[PDB]
Write a protein that binds this ligand. Structure first.
Ligand SMILES: [Cl-]
Ligand SMILES: [Cl-]
Length: 162
């Protein structure tokens, strides 16, 4: 198991524009297109990202090319961020995967705001961290995915995903 396989299970693969759990326009493997409620805006944002007039639809290869870009961006965002970096540095390889999963899903800024949790992770206080993460809006909005990620931090194994 690796970060790529982990995210393909959590995000799935959609070839047509859709609305996420927060109602935003998304496509491919969890690729946020826009936060604007306009479907034309989303379509526009899509053509720019693909470099082709698509009419709201993409090929599997396009989705994969967007996935590679977003995982790279997630990893680079972590490493660049003063709050995120030290946390990543401190962790084993499995738990590092969990943190990249969160960043991919809620952006650098979003995760950088989980102050209490990140400090507990850095102190290796597994149970306290899992319990704190369980009270977030994040958790309440997408509970099955969040529990998988949470269990990944709690345990340091890939069990939630076999
Ligand atoms: Cl928190
Ligand atoms: Cl879910």
């Amino acid at each position: 198991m690796n970060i790529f396989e982990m995210l393909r299970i959590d995000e799935g693969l959609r070839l047509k524009i859709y609305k996420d759990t927060e109602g935003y326009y998304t496509i491919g493997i969890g690729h946020l297109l826009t936060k604007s409620p306009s479907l034309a805006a989303a379509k526009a944002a899509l053509a720019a990202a693909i470099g082709r007039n698509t009419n709201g639809v993409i090929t599997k290869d396009e989705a994969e090319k967007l996935f590679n870009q977003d995982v790279d961006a997630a990893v680079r965002g972590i490493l660049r961020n003063a709050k995120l970096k030290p946390v990543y540095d401190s962790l084993d390889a499995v738990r590092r995967a969990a943190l990249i999963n969160m960043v991919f899903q809620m952006g650098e800024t979003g995760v950088a705001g989980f102050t209490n949790s990140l400090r507990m992770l850095q102190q290796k206080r597994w149970a306290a961290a899992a319990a704190a993460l369980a009270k977030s809006r994040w958790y309440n909005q997408t509970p099955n995915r969040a529990k998988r990620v949470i269990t990944t931090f709690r345990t340091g194994t890939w069990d939630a995903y076999k």
